[PDB]
Amino acid sequence: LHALLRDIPAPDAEAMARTQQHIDGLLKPPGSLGRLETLAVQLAGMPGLNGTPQVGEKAVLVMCADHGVWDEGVAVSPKIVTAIQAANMTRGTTGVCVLAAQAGAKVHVIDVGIDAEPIPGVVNMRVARGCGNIAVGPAMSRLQAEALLLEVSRYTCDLAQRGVTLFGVGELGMANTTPAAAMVSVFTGSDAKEVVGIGANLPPSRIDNKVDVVRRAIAINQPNPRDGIDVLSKVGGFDLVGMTGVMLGAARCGLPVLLDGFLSYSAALAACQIAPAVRPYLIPSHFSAEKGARIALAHLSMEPYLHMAMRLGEGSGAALAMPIVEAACAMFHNMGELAASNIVLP
Amino acid sequence: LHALLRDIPAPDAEAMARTQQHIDGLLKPPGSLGRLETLAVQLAGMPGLNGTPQVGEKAVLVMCADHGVWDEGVAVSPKIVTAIQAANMTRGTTGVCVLAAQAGAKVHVIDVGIDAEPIPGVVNMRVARGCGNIAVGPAMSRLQAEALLLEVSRYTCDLAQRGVTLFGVGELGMANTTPAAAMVSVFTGSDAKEVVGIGANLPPSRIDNKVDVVRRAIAINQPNPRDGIDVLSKVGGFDLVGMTGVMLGAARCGLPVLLDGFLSYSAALAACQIAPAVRPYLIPSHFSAEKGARIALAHLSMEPYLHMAMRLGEGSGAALAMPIVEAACAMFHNMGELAASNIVLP
Ligand SMILES: O=C(O)c1ccc[n+]([C@@H]2O[C@H](COP(=O)([O-])O)[C@@H](O)[C@H]2O)c1
Ligand SMILES: O=C(O)c1ccc[n+]([C@@H]2O[C@H](COP(=O)([O-])O)[C@@H](O)[C@H]2O)c1
Ligand SMILES: Cc1cc(N)c(N)cc1C
Numbered sequence: 013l014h015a016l017l018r019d020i021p022a023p024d025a026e027a028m029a030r031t032q033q034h035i036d037g038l039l040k041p042p043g044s045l046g047r048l049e050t051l052a053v054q055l056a057g058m059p060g061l062n063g064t065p066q067v068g069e070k071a072v073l074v075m076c077a078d079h080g081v082w083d084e085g086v087a088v089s090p091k092i093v094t095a096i097q098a099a100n101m102t103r104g105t106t107g108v109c110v111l112a113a114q115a116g117a118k119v120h121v122i123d124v125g126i127d128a129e130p131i132p133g134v135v136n137m138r139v140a141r142g143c144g145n146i147a148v149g150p151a152m153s154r155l156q157a158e159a160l161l162l163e164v165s166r167y168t169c170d171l172a173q174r175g176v177t178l179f180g181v182g183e184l185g186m187a188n189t190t191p192a193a194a195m196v197s198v199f200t201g202s203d204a205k206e207v208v209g210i211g212a213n214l215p216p217s218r219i220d221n222k223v224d225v226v227r228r229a230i231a232i233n234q235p236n237p238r239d240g241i242d243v244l245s246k247v248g249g250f251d252l253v254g255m256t257g258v259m260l261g262a263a264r265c266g267l268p269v270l271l272d273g274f275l276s277y278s279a280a281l282a283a284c285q286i287a288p289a290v291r292p293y294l295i296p297s298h299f300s301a302e303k304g305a306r307i308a309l310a311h312l313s314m315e316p317y318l319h320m321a322m323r324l325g326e327g328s329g330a331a332l333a334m335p336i337v338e339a340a341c342a343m344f345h346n347m348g349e350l351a352a353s354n355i356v357l358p
Numbered sequence: 359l360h361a362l363l364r365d366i367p368a369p370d371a372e373a374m375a376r377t378q379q380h381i382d383g384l385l386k387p388p389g390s391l392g393r394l395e396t397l398a399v400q401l402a403g404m405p406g407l408n409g410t411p412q413v414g415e416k417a418v419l420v421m422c423a424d425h426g427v428w429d430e431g432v433a434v435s436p437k438i439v440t441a442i443q444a445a446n447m448t449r450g451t452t453g454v455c456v457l458a459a460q461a462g463a464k465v466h467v468i469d470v471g472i473d474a475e476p477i478p479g480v481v482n483m484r485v486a487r488g489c490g491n492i493a494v495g496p497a498m499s500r501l502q503a504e505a506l507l508l509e510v511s512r513y514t515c516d517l518a519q520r521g522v523t524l525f526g527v528g529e530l531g532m533a534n535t536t537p538a539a540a541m542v543s544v545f546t547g548s549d550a551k552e553v554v555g556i557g558a559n560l561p562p563s564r565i566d567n568k569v570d571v572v573r574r575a576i577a578i579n580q581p582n583p584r585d586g587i588d589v590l591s592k593v594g595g596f597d598l599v600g601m602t603g604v605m606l607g608a609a610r611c612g613l614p615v616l617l618d619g620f621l622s623y624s625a626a627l628a629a630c631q632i633a634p635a636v637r638p639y640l641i642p643s644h645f646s647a648e649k650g651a652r653i654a655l656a657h658l659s660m661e662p663y664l665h666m667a668m669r670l671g672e673g674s675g676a677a678l679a680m681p682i683v684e685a686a687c688a689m690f691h692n693m694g695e696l697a698a699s700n701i702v703l704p
């Protein structure tokens with residue numbers, strides 16, 4: 013794991029320089045394509061893409077798991093929905109499945125801790141039947157966190173061998189916006205009230221209880237904000253740990269990762285805390301309607317491309333933004349050049 | 359033309375109701391897909407789509423024309439770039455061509471007033487070799503404006519016959535952000551300084567001159583803000599008139615139109631002023647980096663889906679958002695239902 017974090021490659025400034033020069037000479041006013049140009053350059057710096065903005069196979073990894081904190085009354089959805097929905101993921105009827113299909117990406121459903129019997133067709137990496145109730149103690153041990161990080165990381169970079177060049181991350185777990193809020197609060201230094209949202213339609217009246225639970229989880233566990241793994245194991249979850257692992261794996265693989273919503277933001281904060289070298293590989297997708305989204309994105313210093321007021325999770329936003337990443341590549345490779353048209357601009 | 363505006367159909371509330379009910383029963387927390395759900399319902403109300411959110415063939419109409427106000431030193435790009443770029447549009451090497459190809463849409467290049475010899479492969483609807491310099495008088499006569507509106511409208515709704523269900527609008531004309539700013543100023547009531555931007559990389563030092571020109575154009579022409587056609591003919595342009603015509607044509611055809619950038623916003627203001635019934639058919643794409651974008655979007659009461667800091671024009675943003683429109687349809691048609699999975703939510 014120390015080896016893993018140690019070998020994360022730095023962006024290729026040489027490739028980025030050639031990219032910028034090429035973009036500037038395209039049939040358009042310099043910089044007129046805004047963030048599309050910026051995105052194209054970023055990709056070019058990623059060693060896994062071979063010095064150029066390109067997109068081969070696409071995959072969305074969905075980490076599924078249950079949370080003990082569900083018993084604290086912080087989620088209105090039945091607990092079994094996690095297992096049921098994970099199963100639907102294999103049938104391609106879920107939101108991320110439909111959106112991924114539109115983007116030509118493949119959805120990988122991974123069980124890292126669902127509290128139910130194993131689901132056929134689902135990748136099995138189950139740590140336990142649900143994580144501990146963070147309200148009264150840790151969600152898991154530090155070893156269980158590190159082990160899962162390692163496992164998911166290898167799985168991710170292994171997919172690279174099969175031709176995957178763009179990753180999307182997502183989750184599925186009833187009550188997971190609670191540990192996510194706790195993590196955001198700890199990494200950010202913001203009060204729980206500022207980060208706790210309604211998750212999956214939590215009634216406004218029950219919001220006060222959710223804030224109390226987050227506070228309790230933090231007071232009891234005393235997670236070290238300077239230790240990302242410590243925070244994840246104490247007030248996080250298996251699904252959140254998995255998302256972090258995907259980010260570390262892609263970074264080590266020198267490939268781009270598309271974040272999704274609020275849950276992915278907390279995992280991204282943890283990842284960047286564990287290994288800053290990961291940041292250059294992160295690509296935002298949309299701006300989650302969850303209350304604590306603005307704060308989480310600010311500390312990540314990211315500005316999403318899409319404002320859809322989405323809050324489904326599953327990696328649905330990640331899939332929706334994949335066409336954008338491909339558009340930056342198309343621009344870079346298919347556009348004509350000013351010089352070829354004898355156009356000279358000041 | 360009065361017949362045209364008179365026959366614009368109202369949205370189908372019955373179809374929209376069935377749509378909302380169907381979306382609410384999808385395999386996800388009600389409303390969790392945010393603006394995707396809202397978009398899906400909007401499409402369902404459009405009579406041309408036959409009571410359901412669907413997308414058949416896609417087209418982007420690019421209105422090209424030159425402006426006399428160019429001689430006032432408000433644009434840094436050579437005037438011939440309009441003709442040269444219009445030609446490149448036929449070769450598929452321009453920004454909108456590359457982005458449209460990615461979206462599977464066809465680009466229609468239409469010449470409504472380029473100041474150069476006719477370009478082969480370009481649809482000819484030329485009103486004149488460039489419009490009048492709005493700084494010293496009107497850009498065109500009221501009749502020339504009404505005639506072009508009618509011509510473009512018919513062309514647009516005629517494409518519907520060929521299977522087009524989604525339209526994208528765009529333009530090409532050196533110096534056109536000047537008349538666009540003038541129009542936004544008049545329709546909005548905002549001062550020129552608040553709406554004039556740098557267009558295609560206009561040096562910050564030359565911005566003062568551009569503001570003066572806009573003021574002069576308004577003072578001399580005295581356009582009636584309550585008369586959209588009056589405003590277009592006086593301080594608008596052929597390309598701006600064409601964009602307005604596309605919007606009126608699609609609306610009459612009961613079909614959706616994707617706006618592009620700042621130039622499209624001014625055309626949209628004019629269109630909604632001429633016929634309010636057009637508003638329900640307008641779909642925003644991205645948020646233009648042009649200074650007067652926020653104000654124009656506010657009066658249009660629209661919130662773009664994409665924040666790419668783009669300012670190329672051509673309809674490049676419109677093309678970039680087409681996948682989003684298709685995603686709303688995919689969600690609506692391909693997602694599973696809660697009842698089928700025995701999932702019950704409060
Ligand atoms: O991705 C987001 O921004 C997102 C925001 C709110 C809710 N969710 C989804 O809803 C679940 C978490 O909501 P909750 O109320 O059970 O804490 C989880 O399974 C996520 O997939 C996801
Ligand atoms: O669409 C926009 O928001 C947009 C914003 C700024 C500039 N443009 C493009 O640049 C041209 C107008 O810029 P300018 O400086 O000649 O007034 C015109 O041909 C447009 O296609 C387009
Ligand atoms: C200079 C220039 C300006 C614009 N507006 C466009 N579309 C293209 C080029 C090349």
Ligand SMILES: Cc1cc(N)c(N)cc1C
Pocket residue numbers: 089093097184185212324325326385386387701703
């Ligand atoms: C209830 C519920 C919640 C979530 N978070 C998801 N993805 C799906 C469903 C059905």
